[PDB]
Design a protein around this ligand. Structure first.
Ligand SMILES: CCCCCCCC/C=C\CCCCCCCC(=O)OC[C@@H](O)CO
Ligand SMILES: CCCCCCCC/C=C\CCCCCCCC(=O)OC[C@@H](O)CO
Ligand SMILES: CCCCCCCC/C=C\CCCCCCCC(=O)OC[C@@H](O)CO
Ligand SMILES: *C/C=C(C)/C=C/C=C(C)/C=C/C1=C(C)CCCC1(C)C
Ligand SMILES: CCCCCCCCCCCCCCCC
Ligand SMILES: CCCCCCCCCCCCCC
Ligand SMILES: CCCCCCCCCCCC
Ligand SMILES: CCCCCCCCCCCC
Ligand SMILES: CCCCCCCCCC
Ligand SMILES: CCCCCCCCCC
Length: 234
């Protein structure tokens, strides 16, 4: 019955921890890229941007979440809406896809609709998060279809040779992309259980997405960075 529907100190403490890790990753990548040859630096900068944006969003959430506003719903169904995460995601999820797109020869037209589907997905999530009642699930389902669309586009360079830079990169591209898709599918499950269904509380959703964000941003970035270094060195 809409358990624990407001952020408490548990969720705030989790956000400060993720803030610290995101900030540290951004700093470490920023020092590291100074030592690396010019062809690799764009990939470092993309990941510095990702972790910096995420750190800023988690700073905002940790400073403000205890205000227990805004909310959606009334009476016993009222639940806090944490929306800073969506502002993070509309900038970082295109950059996370760009990490892999840079390993391919995708044409601009294809990059355009993959990135468009990604941005639409986030837009549907935040609209749904503020929607009271059953229409929230229309936004949710269309956002899920957008995830399927962007995933299909990202999968195509695996088996379309004309979309590949080198057959060499296919193993790492495939493995990194499967890791990404696995993690990204968990986000709508958390949303459906929390923001949508009010089945899990706000601190639980914060912790779940804090774990996902650490896996999907700095740990993923280390995998991408290792990949481009190994490929360039051979
Ligand atoms: C050009 C660089 C990329 C674009 C600029 C940075 C992108 C976004 C960065 C961080 C995420 C946005 C931070 C979110 C800022 C909103 C503050 C908030 O969450 O309010 C809490 C409530 O209590 C108030 O209603
Ligand atoms: C509502 C605000 C939305 C803000 C979205 C910000 C996203 C910006 C980041 C990325 C956008 C996509 C830019 C894509 C840049 C071109 C990709 C590229 O260079 O790869 C081409 C390959 O075929 C060869 O390597
Ligand atoms: C490819 C690897 C995939 C990794 C999957 C990562 C899964 C992360 C998502 C969920 C993990 C569960 C952790 C979330 C555990 C929440 C429990 C909690 O914080 O209790 C606080 C009280 O409010 C409870 O009432
Ligand atoms: C660093 C942050 C990441 C990788 C966040 C990824 C978020 C998603 C894949 C969100 C997906 C959603 C849907 C598929 C449907 C609508 C609700 C969302 C926004 C949670
Ligand atoms: C190929 C894209 C697949 C799209 C799958 C969408 C699944 C969404 C789950 C539906 C959850 C709605 C629950 C409604 C609660 C009343
Ligand atoms: C409450 C404890 C939650 C722990 C969840 C941690 C998930 C770890 C998944 C790691 C898989 C990715 C390889 C590093
Ligand atoms: C205040 C910063 C001191 C320098 C830390 C980064 C070192 C960059 C040197 C790389 C040149 C090859
Ligand atoms: C392709 C993405 C599928 C996401 C499905 C999530 C369904 C779990 C939500 C639970 C709502 C009660
Ligand atoms: C090249 C690294 C860019 C890092 C900054 C990205 C934007 C930060 C927004 C707070
Ligand atoms: C780069 C740091 C990656 C951290 C992964 C954390 C997994 C969740 C542990 C609670």
């Amino acid at each position: 019955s809409n358990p624990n529907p407001f952020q408490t100190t548990l969720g705030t403490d989790a956000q400060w921890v993720v803030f610290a890790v995101m900030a540290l990753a951004a700093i470490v990548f920023s020092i590291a890229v100074q030592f690396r040859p010019l062809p690799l630096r764009l990939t470092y900068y993309v990941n510095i941007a990702i972790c910096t944006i995420a750190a800023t969003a988690y700073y905002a959430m940790a400073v403000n979440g205890g205000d227990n506003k805004p909310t959606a719903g009334t009476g016993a169904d009222e639940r806090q809406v944490i929306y800073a995460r969506y502002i993070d995601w509309v900038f970082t999820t295109p950059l996370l896809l760009l990490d892999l797109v840079l390993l391919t020869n995708m044409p601009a037209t294809m990059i355009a609709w993959i990135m468009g589907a990604d941005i639409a997905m986030i837009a549907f999530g935040i609209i749904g998060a503020f929607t009271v009642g059953s229409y929230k699930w229309f936004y949710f389902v269309v956002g899920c279809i957008m995830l399927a669309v962007l995933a299909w586009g990202m999968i195509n360079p695996i088996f379309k040779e004309e979309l590949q830079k080198h057959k060499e990169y296919t193993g790492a591209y495939t493995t990194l992309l499967i890791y990404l898709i696995v993690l990204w599918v968990i986000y709508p499950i958390v949303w459906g259980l929390g923001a949508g269904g009010h089945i899990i509380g706000v601190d639980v959703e914060i912790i779940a997405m804090g774990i996902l964000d650490l896996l999907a941003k700095p740990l993923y970035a280390i995998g991408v960075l290792i990949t481009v270094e190994v490929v360039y060195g051979k």
